[PDB]
Design a protein around this ligand. Structure first.
Ligand SMILES: O=c1ccn([C@@H]2O[C@H](COP(=O)(O)OP(=O)(O)O)[C@@H](O)[C@H]2O)c(=O)[nH]1
Length: 620
C-alpha cells in the first residue's frame, strides 16, 4: 500500500493517459466514476484545479470538469492498444451513466467521435453504422461508449447473438440513468423496454450482467410512456428468483402455520428509506401505527431510520448481513421465529433488498404499498394497498388491489411547512410564470413537447420555472440544455434548492403544470399551500392517476384534470390566457381547500383488511 492511492484525482488520470500506462489510467478513471456515483453526480471530493475565472461560476466549473474528463477519455479509448480487464468491463458498464453525463454535459454531447475510430470498413454505406473487427475487445469498448445520447446505429438481435451477456449489460446501463429525457436517449430506452424483456427472461442469474443497478432498471421503466413498460420487471423477477435458488440455495418458508405475539398475529415490515422527514413515513406511518390494533408489528430497516420511524412498530431491528444472501437469511429468520402472517413492504424498488425479498415466500400474506407506485409483476406478492381514489385501471397491476377508503392513509404533515402565508395574486401580468416541480426522471420529450405547444399557442407570453428536484452536479448542465432545446428564453432550469427557496421560486409563479406520465404528489400539496392552481394529466396507472385523486381531495375543478395531451395543452393555455378566471380560482382555493383533510381520517382499514384476509386463510 501507498498513501493517497485511492483519491479521485483528475490530474492523475490525465497523467496516466499521457504516459500511455493503460492500467493506471483505467483505475484512475474508475475512481472518478465511482466517486461521481457516490456523490450522485456531484463533483465534491474529486481533486482538480481550474482557472481562477471559474471560482464562483459553478455550472461553468462543472462543464470544465466534464470537458477535461471527456478529452482524457477520448485519448484513452481512441488508442487502438487499450485493452480492458474483464473485471474492468463490468465496472465500466455499471458506471456507464456517469460517462454518459461526462459527455452530455460537455460540448461533445456523446462519444460517437470515439466510436467512429473503431470503424474498419471504408465503404459506408451509412456512416452511422460502425463495423468493427471481430476482436471481442472491440465489441466491449464499443458498448462502454454506446451512450444514451449516441447517434450510431445499434442492432440488438445481432448483438444478442454474438454475446447475450454483454448485450444485457448494455440494456442495463442504458436503462440506469436518472435522467433519460432527450428524444435520442428516451427513444433508445423505449426500444429496450419492448425488446429486452423476452431476452432477459432467458437469462440464468445475475453473475455476468451489471447487477448493482438492477433496482434502477426495476424503477426507471415506470417513466416511459408505453402501456407495457413494466414487462422488464416480470423478466427481472424470474432471473432474481432463479438467482436466489441457484446462487443462494434459497428455501421458501412453510407458511401453513402462523405464530403469535401479545395474542396477535405478526406483521413483519421490510423498510426502504423510512426516515420521518421523508415521504414514505408521511404517507404510511399512520396506517401502520393503526395496524397495531390487530397485529404485532416488527420493523426491519437500516440505521437511516430515526427514532420516530422506529416508534411506528412494536419492535424494530436492523437488517443484518454482509451480502444479499445473508440479509435474506436474516429476514427469513425473523419471519420464522415469529411465524409471520403478514409480510409487508410500504415501498418496493428503492433498495435491492426489497426487490429480492419480494421473490420469496416468507408469510402466507405478502403485500406491498405504493411508495414507489408501480406493480411488482412478482407471483410472490398477493396484495397492493392503495387509496381507492388513486387507482385508474386495475389491469395495470398483476396483484390484486386492496382499495382502501380515500381517507384511510392520513398523512403526517412536514415539519418544514410554513406557518404564515403571503399570496401574490398578480393582477397585471405581462408575463405568465408557470411553475413545474419535478425530478429529472419525470422529464421526457412528450412532457416537454406539450410545454412547447403551450408556449407556441398561448396568446400571452409565458415563462416556465422548473424547480428541479435533485438536479445537481454534472447532470444539471445537460438537463438545462434539454429544457432549452424546447423553450429557449421561455424557461428557467433551477437546480435542486433547499425547501424555503424552492417555495420562493413557486411563490413567484401564476399557475403550475404537472409532469406526465408520472405525476406529482408532494408538488400538488406545495401548490395548494401557496394558493396556486395548475393542470395535471391523468391516466390509467396509479402514478398517472394520483394527481386526479389529489386534485379532487383538495377541491380543484375537473376541467384542470385533462385526459390527453391535447387537452392538457388546451386547459394549460386556458388557465394562462384567462387571467380573471385563474385569479377567481386561486381565490377559491385559498378560501376553501382540503389541505386539512389530507392530515386526518381513519387509519384502521389496512389492519382491518389484513385481518379478514388472514382469518379467511386460517379457515382454509
Ligand atoms: O428544489 C426542490 C425540489 C423539491 N423539494 C422537495 O421535494 C418534494 C418533491 O419530491 P418527489 O417528486 O420525489 O416526490 P413527491 O413527494 O412529489 O411525490 C417537494 O415537496 C419538496 O418538498 C425541495 O425541497 N427542493
Amino acid at each position: 500500500t501507498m498513501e493517497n492511492e485511492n483519491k479521485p484525482n483528475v490530474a492523475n488520470f490525465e497523467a496516466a493517459v499521457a504516459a500511455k500506462d493503460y492500467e493506471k489510467a483505467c483505475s484512475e478513471l474508475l475512481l472518478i466514476l465511482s466517486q461521481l456515483d457516490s456523490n450522485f453526480g456531484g463533483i465534491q471530493e474529486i481533486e482538480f484545479e481550474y482557472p481562477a475565472q471559474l471560482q464562483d461560476l459553478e455550472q461553468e466549473k462543472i462543464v470544465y470538469f466534464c470537458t477535461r474528463m471527456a478529452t482524457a477519455i477520448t485519448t484513452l479509448f481512441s488508442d487502438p492498444v487499450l485493452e480492458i480487464s474483464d473485471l474492468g468491463v463490468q465496472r465500466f458498464l455499471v458506471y456507464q451513466r456517469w460517462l454518459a453525463l461526462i459527455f452530455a454535459s460537455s460540448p461533445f454531447v456523446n462519444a460517437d467521435h470515439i466510436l467512429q475510430t473503431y470503424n474498419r470498413e471504408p465503404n459506408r454505406k451509412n456512416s452511422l453504422e460502425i463495423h468493427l473487427d471481430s476482436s471481442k475487445s472491440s465489441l466491449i469498448k464499443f458498448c462502454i461508449l454506446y451512450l444514451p445520447e449516441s447517434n450510431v446505429n445499434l442492432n440488438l438481435d445481432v448483438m444478442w447473438n454474438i454475446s447475450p451477456e454483454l448485450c444485457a449489460s448494455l440494456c442495463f446501463a442504458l436503462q440506469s440513468p436518472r435522467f433519460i429525457g432527450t428524444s435520442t436517449a428516451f427513444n433508445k430506452r423505449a426500444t429496450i423496454l419492448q425488446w429486452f424483456p423476452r431476452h432477459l427472461d432467458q437469462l440464468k442469474n445475475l453473475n455476468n450482467i451489471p447487477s448493482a443497478i438492477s433496482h434502477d432498471v426495476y424503477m426507471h421503466c415506470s417513466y416511459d410512456t408505453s402501456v407495457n413498460k413494466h414487462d422488464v420487471k416480470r423478466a427481472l423477477n424470474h432471473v432474481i428468483r432463479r438467482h436466489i435458488e441457484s446462487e443462494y440455495g434459497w428455501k421458501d418458508r412453510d407458511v401453513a402455520h402462523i405464530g403469535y405475539r401479545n395474542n396477535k398475529p405478526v406483521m413483519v415490515v421490510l423498510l426502504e428509506h423510512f426516515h420521518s422527514a421523508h415521504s414514505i413515513y408521511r404517507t404510511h406511518s399512520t396506517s401502520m401505527i393503526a395496524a397495531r390494533e390487530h397485529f404485532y408489528l416488527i420493523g426491519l430497516g437500516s440505521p437511516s431510520v430515526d427514532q420516530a420511524g422506529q416508534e411506528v412498530f412494536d419492535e424494530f431491528h436492523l437488517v443484518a448481513g454482509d451480502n444479499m444472501k445473508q440479509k435474506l437469511e436474516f429476514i427469513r429468520s425473523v419471519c420464522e421465529s415469529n411465524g409471520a402472517a403478514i409480510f409487508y413492504m410500504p415501498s418496493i424498488g428503492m433498495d435491492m433488498t426489497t426487490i429480492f425479498a419480494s421473490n420469496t415466500r416468507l408469510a402466507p400474506i405478502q403485500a406491498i404499498a405504493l411508495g414507489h407506485p408501480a406493480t411488482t409483476h412478482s407471483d410472490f406478492i398477493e396484495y397492493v394497498i392503495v387509496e381507492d381514489d388513486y387507482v385508474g385501471s386495475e389491469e395495470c397491476f398483476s396483484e390484486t388491489l386492496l382499495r382502501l377508503p380515500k381517507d384511510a392513509l392520513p398523512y403526517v404533515p412536514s415539519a418544514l411547512a410554513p406557518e404564515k402565508v403571503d399570496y401574490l395574486l398578480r393582477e397585471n401580468p405581462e408575463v405568465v410564470n408557470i411553475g413545474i416541480a419535478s425530478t429529472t426522471m419525470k422529464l421526457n420529450p412528450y412532457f416537454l413537447e406539450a410545454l412547447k405547444a403551450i408556449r407556441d399557442r398561448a396568446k400571452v407570453k409565458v415563462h416556465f420555472h422548473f424547480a428541479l428536484g435533485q438536479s445537481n452536479g454534472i447532470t444539471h448542465p445537460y438537463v438545462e440544455r434539454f429544457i432549452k432545446s424546447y423553450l429557449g428564453d421561455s424557461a428557467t432550469a433551477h437546480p435542486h434548492s433547499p425547501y424555503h427557496q424552492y417555495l420562493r421560486i413557486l411563490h413567484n409563479c401564476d399557475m403550475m403544470v404537472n409532469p406526465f406520465p408520472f405525476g406529482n404528489t408532494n408538488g400538488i400539496i406545495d401548490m395548494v399551500t401557496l394558493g396556486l392552481v395548475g393542470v395535471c394529466k391523468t391516466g390509467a396507472e396509479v402514478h398517472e392517476h394520483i394527481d386526479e385523486g389529489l386534485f379532487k381531495r383538495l377541491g380543484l375543478p375537473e376541467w384542470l384534470i385533462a385526459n390527453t395531451v391535447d387537452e392538457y395543452v388546451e386547459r394549460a393555455v386556458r388557465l394562462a390566457e384567462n387571467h380573471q378566471e385563474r385569479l377567481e380560482l386561486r381565490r377559491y382555493i385559498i378560501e376553501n381547500n382540503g389541505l386539512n383533510t389530507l392530515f386526518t381520517g381513519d387509519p384502521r382499514p389496512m389492519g382491518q383488511v389484513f385481518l379478514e384476509k388472514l382469518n379467511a386463510f386460517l379457515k382454509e
